[PDB]
Design a protein around this ligand. Sequence first.
Ligand SMILES: [Zn+2]
Ligand SMILES: [Zn+2]
Ligand SMILES: [Zn+2]
Length: 178
Amino acid sequence: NSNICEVCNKWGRLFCCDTCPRSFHEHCHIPSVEANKNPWSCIFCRIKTIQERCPESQSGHQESEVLMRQMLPEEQLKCEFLLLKVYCDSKSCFFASEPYYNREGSQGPQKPMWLNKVKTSLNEQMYTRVEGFVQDMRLIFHNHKEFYREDKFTRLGIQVQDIFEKNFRNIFAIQETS
Ligand SMILES: [Zn+2]
Ligand SMILES: [Zn+2]
Ligand SMILES: [Zn+2]
């Protein structure tokens, strides 16, 4: 197995996947690494299994279809995996914890959002459709763009949003377009 966490790339108390060489801190993995379970497979392995079991799930989809899907266990998992892929980028640190807003010339957002809040919402099964989770995730970046205006810091928001979007189109097999 790997000697560092797949998500945050640091050593520590690691749990090891039994079906691949990745390792994880307990609360870096989403969901949190499970108490017993031997063997234990990580979320990367669980997602590969879905695809191997139904090869056709990789054929192109419309985003409008995907967003209306109810959060059954497979959609749940996929949103969990998407949230994790955003946390794998070190610039996610800017969006993890509850922000605050006191900048000359800007007002705070009406609806603050952050990664940890979405992680809790996922954990507590608060989303009934994929739409819910995708809306909260895209709001994080939209809030940021609006607040930071022409400060160059806005770019972080565009950066992490791009990672969110690429993984969204990968995980949910959105039909490729020009
Ligand atoms: Zn970690
Ligand atoms: Zn694995
Ligand atoms: Zn099938």
